[PDB]
């Protein structure tokens, strides 16, 4: 009964009240002198939902990647795809630009600090060029997977899935039927574990409401003022994203901006209330058909942009690392900028595009800006902003599907 109404309640709406009831909670017990029972009695749930998503991280990049590599066989490049490819990496790449400049004008974190442990964060000196170039390539394709390293599974999975391709389509039937055999095992186990996501997020407003709770009792009231700067930061770069980016390229090519805004409200409403780009594709798709474009160029563009072309995203890792940075109160060089550039616009691309996979990519970002998440500092600052992602998923989504219309649409003009 009870347990039964609480399965088929939307996942969004739920967390959005797990969230409400923490930070009430945690305010309360937090101004009575109650913060030493929360670190003893809720924190462990709080844990516990840290480490299912830790679990999932592995076999969905190993499985995936394989799957992934070996579906597309052709490599063929045509006249419009080019065209299309430059335009989604340069407004990735500007839009991580303009997250940083407003993650720099408005300080997210510069005034809470952390002493988890009683010690400072204490950088640590990068390793070589060369020695990191070096270490993508494994010496044990079994190591890798058992040891926890990801670029190394990700070099593997990527050659093993091109090497099924070629020896699918043989001349010997028995090597052929081998060739299927294991590519279904590799996909059946794909499939299995986007089950386990699904029954992980039904656990996700016990989850969300014990780190919010932990955060707040421990330090409150000061901490909503960085909490409100980092969510008001995101809205005012993307919204600057949508009017100084968009806005700008279509006045260029003559598109009347009043008439791409109405006629493209169906699809940033749906995104808003569904958060998921893979959800709401058939509204995009639905749309462009009124739009006079041609039918070839645009089931093409919509469908590769989807998961390619999420600018929203983008400009959220950059500045969640900032926060994060700040938090630590250490500094980041203006090499290390230059680097969360190219990291953050590669995240771009990883990110599956479900609600929620933004905040699991931006750990990679993390780790090669020199923050890994073993450090227990560190984890007490990805922990605090995982909780209030939901907050800020709905924001970047709207902008990721109005990057897809937009690029469609200029192509198509241009022919
Ligand atoms: N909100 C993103 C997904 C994500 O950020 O993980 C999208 O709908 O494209
Ligand atoms: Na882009
Ligand atoms: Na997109
Ligand atoms: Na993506």
Same mark, same amino acid.
Do not use: W
């Given at each position: 009964?009870?347990?039964?109404?609480? *399965?088929?309640?939307?996942?969004?709406?739920?967390?959005?009240?797990?969230?409400?009831?923490?930070? *009430?909670?945690?305010?309360?017990?937090?101004?009575?002198?109650?913060?030493?029972? %929360?670190?003893?009695?809720?924190?462990?749930?709080?844990? =516990?939902?840290?480490?299912?998503?830790?679990?999932?991280?592995?076999?969905?990049?190993? @499985?995936?990647?394989?799957?992934?590599?070996?579906? *597309?066989?052709?490599?063929?490049?045509?006249?419009?795809?080019?065209?299309?490819?430059?335009?989604? &990496?340069?407004?990735?790449?500007?839009?991580?630009?303009?997250?940083?400049?407003?993650?720099?004008?408005?300080?997210?974190?510069?005034?809470?600090?952390?002493?988890?442990?009683?010690?400072?964060?204490?950088?640590?000196?990068?390793?070589?060029?060369?020695?990191?170039?070096?270490?993508?390539?494994?010496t044990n394709p079994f190591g890798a997977l058992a040891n926890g390293q990801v670029?190394?599974?990700?070099?593997?999975?990527?050659?093993?899935?091109?090497?099924?391709?070629?020896?699918?389509?043989?001349?010997?039937?028995?090597?052929?039927?081998?060739?299927?055999?294991?590519?279904?095992?590799?996909?059946?186990?794909?499939?299995?574990?986007?089950?386990?996501?699904?029954?992980?997020?039904?656990?996700?407003?016990?989850?969300?409401?014990?780190?919010?709770?932990?955060?707040?009792?421990?330090?409150? %009231?000061?901490?909503?003022?960085?909490? @409100?700067?980092?969510?008001? @930061?995101?809205?005012?770069? =993307?919204?600057?994203?949508?009017? &100084?980016?968009?806005?700008?390229?279509?006045?260029?090519?003559?598109?009347?901006?009043?008439?791409?805004?109405?006629?493209?409200?169906?699809?940033?409403?749906?995104?808003?209330?569904?958060?998921?780009?893979?959800?709401?594709?058939?509204?995009?798709?639905?749309?462009?058909?009124?739009?006079?474009?041609?039918?070839?160029?645009?089931?093409?563009?919509?469908?590769?942009?989807?998961?390619?072309?999420?600018?929203?995203?983008? =400009?959220?890792?950059?500045?969640?690392?900032?926060?994060?940075?700040?938090?630590?109160?250490?500094?980041?060089?203006?090499?290390?900028?230059?680097?969360?550039?190219?990291?953050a616009v590669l995240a771009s691309i990883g990110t599956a595009g479900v609600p929620?996979?933004?905040?699991?990519?931006?750990?990679?970002? &993390?780790?090669?800006v020199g923050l890994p998440l073993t450090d227990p500092n560190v984890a007490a600052?990805?922990?605090?902003?995982?909780?209030?992602?939901?907050? &800020?998923?709905?924001?970047?989504?709207?902008?990721?599907?109005?990057?897809?219309?937009?690029?469609?649409?200029?192509?198509?003009?241009?022919?």
């Amino acid at each position: 009964g009870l347990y039964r109404k609480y *399965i088929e309640y939307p996942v969004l709406q739920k967390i959005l009240i797990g969230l409400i009831l923490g930070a *009430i909670v945690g305010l309360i017990l937090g101004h009575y002198g109650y913060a030493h029972a %929360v670190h003893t009695y809720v924190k462990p749930f709080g844990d =516990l939902f840290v480490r299912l998503l830790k679990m999932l991280v592995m076999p969905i990049v190993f @499985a995936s990647l394989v799957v992934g590599a070996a579906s *597309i066989s052709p490599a063929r490049l045509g006249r419009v795809g080019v065209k299309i490819v430059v335009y989604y &990496l340069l407004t990735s790449a500007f839009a991580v630009t303009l997250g940083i400049i407003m993650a720099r004008l408005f300080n997210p974190g510069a005034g809470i600090h952390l002493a988890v442990g009683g010690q400072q964060f204490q950088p640590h000196q990068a390793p070589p060029l060369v020695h990191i170039l070096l270490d993508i390539v494994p010496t044990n394709p079994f190591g890798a997977l058992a040891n926890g390293q990801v670029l190394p599974t990700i070099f593997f999975a990527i050659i093993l899935g091109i090497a099924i391709t070629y020896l699918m389509n043989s001349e010997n039937e028995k090597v052929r039927k081998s060739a299927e055999t294991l590519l279904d095992a590799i996909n059946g186990l794909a499939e299995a574990m986007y089950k386990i996501v699904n029954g992980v997020m039904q656990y996700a407003p016990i989850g969300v409401f014990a780190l919010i709770a932990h955060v707040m009792a421990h330090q409150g %009231v000061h901490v909503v003022g960085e909490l @409100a700067k980092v969510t008001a @930061a995101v809205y005012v770069g =993307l919204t600057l994203q949508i009017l &100084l980016v968009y806005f700008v390229l279509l006045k260029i090519y003559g598109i009347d901006p009043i008439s791409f805004i109405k006629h493209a409200k169906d699809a940033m409403l749906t995104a808003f209330v569904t958060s998921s780009s893979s959800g709401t594709l058939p509204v995009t798709m639905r749309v462009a058909k009124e739009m006079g474009i041609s039918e070839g160029i645009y089931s093409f563009t919509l469908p590769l942009g989807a998961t390619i072309n999420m600018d929203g995203t983008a =400009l959220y890792q950059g500045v969640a690392t900032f926060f994060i940075a700040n938090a630590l109160g250490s500094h980041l060089t203006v090499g290390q900028q230059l680097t969360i550039v190219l990291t953050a616009v590669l995240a771009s691309i990883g990110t599956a595009g479900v609600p929620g996979a933004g905040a699991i990519m931006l750990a990679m970002v &993390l780790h090669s800006v020199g923050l890994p998440l073993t450090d227990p500092n560190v984890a007490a600052a990805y922990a605090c902003i995982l909780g209030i992602d939901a907050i &800020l998923d709905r924001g970047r989504t709207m902008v990721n599907v109005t990057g897809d219309l937009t690029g469609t649409a200029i192509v198509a003009k241009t022919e």
